[PDB]
Amino acid sequence: MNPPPPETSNPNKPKRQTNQLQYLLRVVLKTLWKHQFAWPFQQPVDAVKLNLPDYYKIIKTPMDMGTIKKRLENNYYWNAQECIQDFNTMFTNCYIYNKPGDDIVLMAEALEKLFLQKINELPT
Numbered sequence: 001m002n003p004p005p006p007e008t009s010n011p012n013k014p015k016r017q018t019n020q021l022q023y024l025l026r027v028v029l030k031t032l033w034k035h036q037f038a039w040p041f042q043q044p045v046d047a048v049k050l051n052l053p054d055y056y057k058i059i060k061t062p063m064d065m066g067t068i069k070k071r072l073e074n075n076y077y078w079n080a081q082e083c084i085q086d087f088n089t090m091f092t093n094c095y096i097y098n099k100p101g102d103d104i105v106l107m108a109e110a111l112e113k114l115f116l117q118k119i120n121e122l123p124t
């Protein structure tokens, strides 16, 4: 019942290393990945194992940090904005599916505050 995970390899498009992409992997992803609340966000939502009714009927653009980490490690992103959009999608999905006060929402909000603190120091 789960869909295949988001693509993470980039076989047909060009690749580049930029200072912003370096910061996104070394600082932003690394800081959130090591956070105590990271585990639920480290791989695609398994709606079957988690018993999440209608998850993939409600969430049509799933995203997670395991995918973002692999995308950065595989040079899937050409522009830093593509990666920032993926983090935003991951948080937004959680807020859409869940309710205020749910444990997962409080965890996502703490991770998003940390994301915003780090994104404030994104370079040029």
Ligand SMILES: COc1cc(-c2ccc3c(c2)nc(CCc2ccccc2)n3CCN2CCOCC2)cccc1=O
Pocket: 039, 040, 041, 045, 046, 049, 050, 052, 093, 094, 097, 098, 104
């Ligand atoms: C990201 O969005 C959501 C996430 C989750 C979610 C909550 C807890 C989660 C998780 C996802 N993924 C994991 C870790 C991976 C996992 C998944 C399946 C069973 C076991 C581990 N865990 C920890 C499980 N815990 C610890 C080990 O004892 C079992 C209980 C729930 C709801 C809505 C969402 O929108």
